[PDB]
Design brief:
Blueprint: E1 16-21, E2 30-35, E3 40-46, H1 54-64, E4 75-79, E5 86-90, H2 97-103, H3 111-131, E6 133-134, E7 143-145, E8 151-153, E9 160-161, E10 167-168, H4 182-187, E11 189-190, H5 192-207, H6 219-227, H7 240-249, H8 260-283
Antiparallel strand pairs: 1-2, 2-3, 3-5, 4-5, 6-9, 7-8, 10-11
Helix pairs in contact: 3-5, 3-8, 5-7
The structure holds the ligand Cc1cc(Nc2cc(N3CCN(C)CC3)nc(Sc3ccc(NC(=O)C4CC4)cc3)n2)[nH]n1.
Residues 22-23, 27, 30, 43, 45, 73, 87, 89-92, 94-96, 144, 154-155 line the site of the ligand Cc1cc(Nc2cc(N3CCN(C)CC3)nc(Sc3ccc(NC(=O)C4CC4)cc3)n2)[nH]n1.
PDB class: transferase
Keywords: kinase, kinase inhibitor, abl, transferase
Assembly: monomeric
């Protein structure tokens, strides 16, 4: 018999040491912290006093208690009973994937590692796909990097458990044009298929080591271009099979886009073969 107000996810703020702010203010009020009890470094997202976004914060916290996967950043606890609200998650030492890609050593982050990243992400999405959840904000900036190129998807502020086949965002809502599928931009309609489209754009960010999508193109012209069947070109050095998958993710009709299960299977096979090849190449100097 547990105590009356026992809540398995709650923890006292005093258990956490708050340190420096992370993400240079780009990700809101998030700080690096330490869960003293375990001398564990953790990430802590908080909410400013006053704020008119408390509901959004609680929802984000709620969703994280519902998902668990090796490639989804893990919620460790929350402080949502009174005033300063906290969301505590495992710490990913290398930060967000976009900056990781923009500052990496390409000798280390090579062809094999890029496929490994996409394989890990598709794995997480296959999990969400089968749970019938939508992420709604897939982008390299929303993925994190740990030791040994470990990659996990994060930022579930818009993640939704779907009841139907689609989700209609409220009128007036604004979205990241470059990662947003046409049906979403035009009718605010989202589905696992719109996440697939987004995944295609994320593959492109990986392939280009973090370049911003649709180079030089004006945001106001993106939709018109897509409608005429324009799509970003194959990045220099990007394997043909990967670009094909990319193009499949950008099929105009959501029903024509592949499933994450299919995407994951494709990358798993490409990663394996590419990995083997890399190890055999190293073998050329040591047997
Ligand atoms: C969730 C999470 C985040 C992390 N790790 C990090 C690490 C990081 N770094 C800054 C730059 N150095 C060179 C490397 C480490 N910068 C950020 S910037 C950042 C901070 C927080 C969030 N997201 C949240 O707190 C969400 C999950 C509720 C996203 C990006 N996040 N581990 N776990």
């Amino acid at each position: 018999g547990m105590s009356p107000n026992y809540d398995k996810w709650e923890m006292e703020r005093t258990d956490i040491t708050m340190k420096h702010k992370l993400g240079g203010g780009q990700y809101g009020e998030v700080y690096e912290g330490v869960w003293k009890k375990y001398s564990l470094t953790v990430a802590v997202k908080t909410l400013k006093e006053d704020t008119m976004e408390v509901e959004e914060f609680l929802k984000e916290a709620a969703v994280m208690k519902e998902i668990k996967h090796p490639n989804l950043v893990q919620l460790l606890g929350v402080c949502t009973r009174e005033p300063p609200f906290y969301i505590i998650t495992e710490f990913m030492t290398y930060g967000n994937l976009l900056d990781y890609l923009r500052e990496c050593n390409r000798q280390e982050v090579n062809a094999v590692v890029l496929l490994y990243m996409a394989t890990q992400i598709s794995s997480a999405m296959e999990y969400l796909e089968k749970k019938n959840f939508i992420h709604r904000d897939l982008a390299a900036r929303n993925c994190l990097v740990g030791e040994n190129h470990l990659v996990k998807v994060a930022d579930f502020g818009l993640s939704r458990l779907m009841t139907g086949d689609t989700y209609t965002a409220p009128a007036g809502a604004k979205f990241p044009i470059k990662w947003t599928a046409p049906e979403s931009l035009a009718y605010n309609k989202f589905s696992i298929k719109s996440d697939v489209w987004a995944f295609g754009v994320l593959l492109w960010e990986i392939a280009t080591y973090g370049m911003s999508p649709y180079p030089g193109i004006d945001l106001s012209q993106v939709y018109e271009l897509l409608e005429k069947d324009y799509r970003m070109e194959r990045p220099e050095g990007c394997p043909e099979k990967v670009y094909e998958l990319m193009r499949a993710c950008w099929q105009w009709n959501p029903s024509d886009r592949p499933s994450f299960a299919e995407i994951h299977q494709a990358f798993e096979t490409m990663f394996q073969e590419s990995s083997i090849s890399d190890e055999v190449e190293k073998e050329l100097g040591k047997q």
